[PDB]
Amino acid sequence: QGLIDENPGLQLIIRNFWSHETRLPSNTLDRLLALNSLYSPKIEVHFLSLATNFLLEMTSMSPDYPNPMFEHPLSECEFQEYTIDSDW
Amino acid sequence: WDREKRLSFAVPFREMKPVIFLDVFLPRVTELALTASDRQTKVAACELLHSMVMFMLGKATPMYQLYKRTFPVLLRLACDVDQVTRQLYEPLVMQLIHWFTNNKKFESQDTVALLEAILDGIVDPVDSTLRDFCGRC
Amino acid sequence: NIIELDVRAYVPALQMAFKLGLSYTPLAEVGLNALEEWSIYIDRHVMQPYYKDILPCLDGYLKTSFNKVVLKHLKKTKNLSLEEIRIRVVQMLGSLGGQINKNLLMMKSYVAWDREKRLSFAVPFREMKPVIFLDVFLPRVTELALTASDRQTKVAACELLHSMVMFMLGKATQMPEGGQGAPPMYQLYKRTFPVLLRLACDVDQVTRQLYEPLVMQLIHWFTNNKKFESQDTVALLEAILDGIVDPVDSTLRDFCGRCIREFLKWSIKQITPQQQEKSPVNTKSLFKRLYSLALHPNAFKRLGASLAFNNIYREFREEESLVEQFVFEALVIYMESLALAHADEKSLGTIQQCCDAIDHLCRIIEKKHVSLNKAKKRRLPRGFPPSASLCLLDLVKWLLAHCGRPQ
Amino acid sequence: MSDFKVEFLRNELEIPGQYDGRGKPLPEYHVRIAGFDERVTVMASLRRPKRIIIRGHDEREHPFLVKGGEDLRQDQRVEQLFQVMNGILAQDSACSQRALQLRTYSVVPMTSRLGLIEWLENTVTLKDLLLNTMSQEEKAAYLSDPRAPPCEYKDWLDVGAYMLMYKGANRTETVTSFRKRESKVPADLLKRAFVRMSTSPEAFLALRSHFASSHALICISHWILGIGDRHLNNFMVAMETGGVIGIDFGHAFGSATQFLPVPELMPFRLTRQFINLMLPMKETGLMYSIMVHALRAFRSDPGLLTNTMDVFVKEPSFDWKNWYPRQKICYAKRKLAGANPAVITCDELLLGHEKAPAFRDYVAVARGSKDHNIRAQEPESGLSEETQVKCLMDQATDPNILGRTWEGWEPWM
């Protein structure tokens, strides 16, 4: 229930605490197995969401996940970050 | 849509690369990019749409049906009066036009794309602004 | 005593020996013994003009580098290489001379052929995914699979060369751009292939029977109307001279001639005909280049042209529309081949190639000489200065008027 | 191929100047023309260089540049002589003992209003060969915005007023000006291009070392002639291997600066990048000895040179449009019998530029800018190999950028 803190930092550190190989074992397979054994009778609404969160945040260690998937653009031009207006 | 799927993706890891197909999600994710009250939700789905369409351009290395699925979504979302989605589509629309303008991208999709899009954005009983956007198109 | 005369003509046999002594060391060994003979008997003056052949050819093959303590009377003992050849090579070399031996010996021959090190590879792992650049290994493996002893080792080098070229051709087809053949390795392949082309048909247990099929699948894959847009032409033009018009490797010449006929066959199969009609480099340009190569005055140029035609005749006889459109051209060009072959030595096998050519000509005529018996306004060659509706009688009377030839 | 289709019926039409056989019979099927890759490739210049592309008998394209209207037979003699001596001048140190070899070129003009040459199409001028190497936006701005004002117009100031501004130009201010020329142009990017074209650094080493030595010998040949390669854009270099060909023989017999509307204080161009090919070279080493060998082999050349360019007409029309042939051969003999580069440069300057502003300044910086430059006047009209070459490289090659420079003379580059 702390994974869903209205405090994003608190639930974030809780996610870090869990995803830790102690609380949630590092290997994707055994991480999955622990997740299967970790469901709370009240979280099935967001149990899948948080499980996906943990699974995908494991992919951070993948030293290609932060890398591009393509390196051969069919149409190649200047690529800089684009801006957007976000008035309240 | 078709008995074969093309949106494979091996998830990178240290020792495994689980391949995941994404063809099934496309309808619903297009709906959410089209319909999501939370601006975070709609914006994230639109970003994902942009990323996956760039990916499937990478995949183009004759998938007409995927293109005809994506065209109306582009039509509806481009003419968003809200600043966010039109803001996305400005570079999106121009950049897809430039992808279209390739000679190797002049075969059976881009022409179909345009003839569908500009015609339908005007023939709609609503959104004459979509007609104007298709005029730009 | 006899070989005192025309000492130059004897060098090519030595070059062939040092081309083939790998599979048979005593081959090069007896070539060396002949070298020793020539050193002993002949004067330095006339052997000098090819120290420049001796040392570079000497370079060949040279770059590579019971019984128990108990006294049983050892009755087994009582009842009783290329390397030594290369030792003799260096022996005779030091018996030659510093002026002679320095004949091994500008453009410098390697100027970083590819300025854009695009050929690389990201080696994946568990902690990181390092990236390794492969084009640097490219020229090296070219010389290695090109030149290597240890058929096991040389052929392993060839195997890796095969694998890497297979990878990098597809990688070249990853980010094509405008200009040349997108120049990923286009220009850097117009300089790469000929070695692998001759490796297609090499004297080998293995690399022959896998590289000939390799190049077959390649260039029939590279004869598509989708695989069409000058990616075929780079390899084709590369082949045109090296495979066909070349002093050595005659089996390569025949291999590549039948390869070209097979190639154009597979083209017409998987080229929509207009894509050959709109093709500049096409069957018509093929005819034109054959006319030129027969016309190009040199033993090698004409021999390649004639042998290539004799190869391609297998399908060209099956070709009908072109042969109907092209007889006067073919007849006059083969006439030119005959004239310039009988203006020079006939010991060239191209005289037999031209006999094959006249066989093909009379044969195609005897299918449709009734389609020639009539004056048909098929296109005109330069060998027929009158312009008219071309008839079999027309070529016949032209030949008769041009009989009494100085050759 | 237009009027009369490709055929040998008329004649095996074939490249001019390539039957040049020293008594040996030339081949009949010798490399000739059959077919054509002719497209409209006409470069824009005073000569309208027409690079006509010749698919020879091999059907391989042979682009041939075609110039315009001037005494281009002068260029023919220049190239022929270049082959003559350079081909027997200095290839290697041992071969300089032999006195052989230098890479040269040939041109075949048709009339005094046309000239046919061969368009190599595998070369590039130095300025272009660099302009594609750096960040091209630097090539635009850095060589456009801070090019004339900060260094060139600090040296002078003003077009038109440029020469009279050099009348108010001196040694140290133009030394600072040249220092700003170094800040008007990039540096060491020559090494970048070289290494990106170098797979083996040492085959590289030999190649560009011979390139630099050959360029220096070409430069002293320029000094001998007075060839008008004002800017580095004039000078060519084969992108393939650095092959060298002369450019713009519009001035000779000491006319490099004899009638020039703009100042040309160069006995030979000393572009800084040619020095910055690699920093540790002091230019006092290998090529220094190379030109020492050259002048060592420059003994019996007047018996042919002065006997050859003056053999026929003594170079007509090369100085009226850019005079006495007796005067021209006098200058050639003076420069050829062993001459001070400073004295030759100053006499060439004052002859015709005496009315030009800073004429005294021009001839002075010709004699030298600083003391270690003005001492060049002392070994006047003759001095030893090493002395002459170091004099030319120091008191003549340097003070061209230290007295005054024409903006189109390309001082920064």
Curated annotation (Swiss-Prot), chain B:
Signal peptide: none annotated. The modification Phosphoserine is found at residue 8. It is found in: Nucleus; Nucleus, Nucleolus; Cytoplasm, Cytosol. Autophosphorylated at two clusters, the T2609 cluster and the S2056 cluster. Autophosphorylation induces a conformational change that leads to remodeling of the DNA-PK complex, requisite for efficient end processing and DNA repair. S-nitrosylated by GAPDH. HEAT repeats lie at residues 109-137. Belongs to the PI3/PI4-kinase family. It is linked to Immunodeficiency 26 with or without neurologic abnormalities: A form of severe combined immunodeficiency characterized by reduced or absent T and B cells, recurrent candidiasis, and lower respiratory tract infections. Some patients show dysmorphic features, severe growth failure, microcephaly, seizures, and impaired neurological functions. Serine/threonine-protein kinase that acts as a molecular sensor for DNA damage. Involved in DNA non-homologous end joining (NHEJ) required for double-strand break (DSB) repair and V(D)J recombination. Must be bound to DNA to express its catalytic properties. Promotes processing of hairpin DNA structures in V(D)J recombination by activation of the hairpin endonuclease artemis (DCLRE1C). Recruited by XRCC5 and XRCC6 to DNA ends and is required to (1) protect and align broken ends of DNA, thereby preventing their degradation, (2) and sequester the DSB for repair by NHEJ. DNA-PK is a heterotrimer of PRKDC and the Ku dimer (composed of XRCC6/Ku70 and XRCC5/Ku86). Formation of this complex may be promoted by interaction with ILF3. Component of the core long-range non-homologous end joining (NHEJ) complex (also named DNA-PK complex) composed of PRKDC, LIG4, XRCC4, XRCC6/Ku70, XRCC5/Ku86 and NHEJ1/XLF. Additional component of the NHEJ complex includes PAXX. Following autophosphorylation, PRKDC dissociates from DNA. Interacts with DNA-PKcs-interacting protein (KIP) with the region upstream the kinase domain. This is DNA-dependent protein kinase catalytic subunit. It comes from Homo sapiens (Human). The gene is PRKDC.
From Swiss-Prot, chain D:
Residues 226-234 are annotated as: Catalytic loop. It comes from the Eukaryota. Disulfide bonds: none annotated. Residues 246-271 are annotated as: Activation loop. It is found in: Nucleus; Nucleus, Nucleolus; Cytoplasm, Cytosol. Residues 381-413 form the FATC domain. Residues 42-48 are annotated as: G-loop. Autophosphorylated at two clusters, the T2609 cluster and the S2056 cluster. Autophosphorylation induces a conformational change that leads to remodeling of the DNA-PK complex, requisite for efficient end processing and DNA repair. The modification Phosphoserine is found at residues 45, 135. Residues 36-338 form the PI3K/PI4K catalytic domain. It is linked to Immunodeficiency 26 with or without neurologic abnormalities: A form of severe combined immunodeficiency characterized by reduced or absent T and B cells, recurrent candidiasis, and lower respiratory tract infections. Some patients show dysmorphic features, severe growth failure, microcephaly, seizures, and impaired neurological functions. Belongs to the PI3/PI4-kinase family. DNA-PK is a heterotrimer of PRKDC and the Ku dimer (composed of XRCC6/Ku70 and XRCC5/Ku86). Formation of this complex may be promoted by interaction with ILF3. Component of the core long-range non-homologous end joining (NHEJ) complex (also named DNA-PK complex) composed of PRKDC, LIG4, XRCC4, XRCC6/Ku70, XRCC5/Ku86 and NHEJ1/XLF. Additional component of the NHEJ complex includes PAXX. Following autophosphorylation, PRKDC dissociates from DNA. Interacts with DNA-PKcs-interacting protein (KIP) with the region upstream the kinase domain. Serine/threonine-protein kinase that acts as a molecular sensor for DNA damage. Involved in DNA non-homologous end joining (NHEJ) required for double-strand break (DSB) repair and V(D)J recombination. Must be bound to DNA to express its catalytic properties. Promotes processing of hairpin DNA structures in V(D)J recombination by activation of the hairpin endonuclease artemis (DCLRE1C). Recruited by XRCC5 and XRCC6 to DNA ends and is required to (1) protect and align broken ends of DNA, thereby preventing their degradation, (2) and sequester the DSB for repair by NHEJ. This is DNA-dependent protein kinase catalytic subunit. The chain holds residues 3687 to 4128 of 4128 of the full protein.
